[PDB]
Every structure is written in C-alpha cells, then in structure tokens.
mmCIF file of C-alpha atoms in Angstrom:
data_model
loop_
_atom_site.group_PDB
_atom_site.id
_atom_site.type_symbol
_atom_site.label_atom_id
_atom_site.label_comp_id
_atom_site.label_asym_id
_atom_site.label_seq_id
_atom_site.Cartn_x
_atom_site.Cartn_y
_atom_site.Cartn_z
ATOM 1 C CA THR A 1 -4.841 12.314 15.346
ATOM 2 C CA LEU A 2 -7.184 9.292 15.243
ATOM 3 C CA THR A 3 -7.554 7.006 18.233
ATOM 4 C CA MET A 4 -8.655 3.398 17.900
ATOM 5 C CA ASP A 5 -11.887 4.017 19.755
ATOM 6 C CA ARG A 6 -12.942 6.863 17.525
ATOM 7 C CA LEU A 7 -12.113 4.593 14.572
ATOM 8 C CA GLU A 8 -14.239 1.746 15.975
ATOM 9 C CA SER A 9 -16.976 4.303 16.586
ATOM 10 C CA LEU A 10 -16.617 5.540 12.994
ATOM 11 C CA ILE A 11 -16.942 1.945 11.793
ATOM 12 C CA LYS A 12 -20.177 1.276 13.661
ATOM 13 C CA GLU A 13 -21.564 4.708 12.711
ATOM 14 C CA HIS A 14 -21.096 4.005 9.006
ATOM 15 C CA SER A 15 -23.836 1.364 9.118
ATOM 16 C CA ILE A 16 -26.437 3.996 10.022
ATOM 17 C CA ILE A 17 -25.306 6.611 7.486
ATOM 18 C CA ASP A 18 -28.042 5.171 5.308
ATOM 19 C CA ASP A 19 -31.018 6.100 3.122
ATOM 20 C CA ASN A 20 -33.346 6.951 5.983
ATOM 21 C CA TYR A 21 -30.614 8.961 7.695
ATOM 22 C CA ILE A 22 -30.136 11.383 4.805
ATOM 23 C CA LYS A 23 -33.938 11.551 4.359
ATOM 24 C CA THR A 24 -34.218 12.394 8.060
ATOM 25 C CA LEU A 25 -31.578 15.098 7.696
ATOM 26 C CA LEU A 26 -33.496 16.648 4.798
ATOM 27 C CA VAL A 27 -36.767 16.569 6.709
ATOM 28 C CA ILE A 28 -35.003 18.376 9.565
ATOM 29 C CA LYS A 29 -33.543 20.862 7.095
ATOM 30 C CA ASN A 30 -36.994 21.574 5.740
ATOM 31 C CA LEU A 31 -38.360 22.020 9.273
ATOM 32 C CA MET A 32 -35.681 24.641 10.000
ATOM 33 C CA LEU A 33 -36.302 26.268 6.625
ATOM 34 C CA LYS A 34 -40.093 26.326 6.969
ATOM 35 C CA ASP A 35 -39.736 28.076 10.347
ATOM 36 C CA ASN A 36 -36.674 30.210 9.460
ATOM 37 C CA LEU A 37 -34.736 28.719 12.391
ATOM 38 C CA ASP A 38 -31.177 29.732 13.160
ATOM 39 C CA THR A 39 -31.024 26.881 15.717
ATOM 40 C CA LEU A 40 -32.948 23.674 16.253
ATOM 41 C CA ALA A 41 -33.193 22.436 19.843
ATOM 42 C CA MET A 42 -33.705 18.887 21.083
ATOM 43 C CA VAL A 43 -36.995 19.554 22.903
ATOM 44 C CA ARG A 44 -40.268 17.848 23.756
ATOM 45 C CA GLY A 45 -42.345 16.983 20.716
ATOM 46 C CA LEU A 46 -39.553 17.304 18.129
ATOM 47 C CA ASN A 47 -39.398 13.532 17.638
ATOM 48 C CA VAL A 48 -43.111 13.563 16.735
ATOM 49 C CA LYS A 49 -42.800 16.567 14.418
ATOM 50 C CA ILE A 50 -39.987 14.759 12.580
ATOM 51 C CA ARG A 51 -41.962 11.527 12.312
ATOM 52 C CA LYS A 52 -45.059 13.265 10.952
ATOM 53 C CA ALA A 53 -43.082 15.248 8.388
ATOM 54 C CA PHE A 54 -41.103 12.183 7.297
ATOM 55 C CA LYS A 55 -44.339 10.209 6.828
ATOM 56 C CA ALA A 56 -45.869 13.068 4.807
ATOM 57 C CA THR A 57 -42.701 13.517 2.703
ATOM 58 C CA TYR A 58 -41.929 9.854 1.894
ATOM 59 C CA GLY A 59 -45.080 7.780 2.514
ATOM 60 C CA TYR A 60 -43.740 5.493 5.249
ATOM 61 C CA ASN A 61 -42.072 5.574 8.683
ATOM 62 C CA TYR A 62 -39.067 3.636 9.974
ATOM 63 C CA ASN A 63 -39.075 2.122 13.433
ATOM 64 C CA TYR A 64 -39.040 4.388 16.501
ATOM 65 C CA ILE A 65 -35.696 3.299 17.952
ATOM 66 C CA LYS A 66 -33.904 4.050 14.664
ATOM 67 C CA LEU A 67 -34.761 7.739 15.130
ATOM 68 C CA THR A 68 -32.958 7.603 18.487
ATOM 69 C CA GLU A 69 -29.813 6.266 16.808
ATOM 70 C CA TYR A 70 -30.056 9.034 14.179
ATOM 71 C CA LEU A 71 -30.581 11.763 16.790
ATOM 72 C CA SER A 72 -27.620 10.592 18.873
ATOM 73 C CA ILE A 73 -25.271 11.468 16.010
ATOM 74 C CA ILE A 74 -27.118 14.559 14.780
ATOM 75 C CA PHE A 75 -27.337 16.278 18.170
#
C-alpha cells in the first residue's frame, strides 16, 4: 500500500534525485570498492572523505548542506 504521506515524501525526494546525487552515489561506491568494504558506516570524517573524492573525481564541489540532504536518503 501507499499512504499519502509517503507519496508526498516521494514527490519532494524526486527533486534531489539529481545529477550530483548519482555522482555522489558513485563516489561512495568507489570508496567502498577501493577499500573492499562489505558495509559503509555513517561515522566521523566520512562527509569529508566524500567531499574530497567528489572534488577529485569531478572538478567541483556542491554546497555543504546538499550533502546532508543526500545522506538523509542514502543512510
């Protein structure tokens, strides 16, 4: 079943399923791959490791708070 409030949530979420979201997911995938991780944990310093690797992979960074919106649906 689908409740109205999960639908509304799905509608707002769509707006951040965007270019820098999939690029962030692929940076995270490469972090797990590089380290042979079975699990990735939301721990201190991960936000910085993601930001560095994204900047080195794509040449730019998006704003800090955007990462928080991405992480709240990834984790």
